[PDB]
Amino acid sequence: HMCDAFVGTWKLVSSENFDDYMKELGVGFATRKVAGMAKPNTIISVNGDVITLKTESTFKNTEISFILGQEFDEVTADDRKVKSTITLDGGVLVHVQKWDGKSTTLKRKREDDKLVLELVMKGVTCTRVYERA
Numbered sequence: 001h002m003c004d005a006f007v008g009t010w011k012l013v014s015s016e017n018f019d020d021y022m023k024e025l026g027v028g029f030a031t032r033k034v035a036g037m038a039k040p041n042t043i044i045s046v047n048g049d050v051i052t053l054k055t056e057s058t059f060k061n062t063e064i065s066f067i068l069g070q071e072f073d074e075v076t077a078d079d080r081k082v083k084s085t086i087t088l089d090g091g092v093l094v095h096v097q098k099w100d101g102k103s104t105t106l107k108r109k110r111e112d113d114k115l116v117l118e119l120v121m122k123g124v125t126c127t128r129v130y131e132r133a
């Protein structure tokens with residue numbers, strides 16, 4: 001039940017400020033050029049308490065599986081080794097990543113028929129809108 005609203009196959013339809021977000025992350029220029037053009041699919045599924053989130057794109061795929069509230073180690077699309085915790089607060093799936101004394105947040109919520117992803121690092125806010133494939 002908990003994450004039913006998120007389950008599905010979602011395709012990126014719009015993005016704002018992703019370059020600036022990737023810059024704050026430390027992603028290099030070649031990767032930023034590729035990744036700025038990517039239109040990934042995100043596939044969210046659930047098996048009991050275990051949530052899986054796949055991100056697929058031409059250049060790079062990632063997958064994480066997790067239990068809400070339980071820290072896990074993640075290797076990000078840009079090769080960071082982070083400590084991740086994901087919680088569900090008021091319909092918002094909140095993913096925090098911590099590494100090397102830094103933090104970023106990845107927050108997903110439903111907005112009408114869309115899935116909206118907010119990516120925050122320092123002063124940068126990026127907004128990614130996904131629609132059902």
Ligand SMILES: CCCCCCCCCCCCCC(=O)O
Pocket residue numbers: 012022025027031035038040042055057059060076077078117119128
């Ligand atoms: C899509 C290629 C991304 C490659 C490098 C940037 C990685 C940044 C962290 C990933 C942020 C998630 C973006 C998303 O799911 O839309």
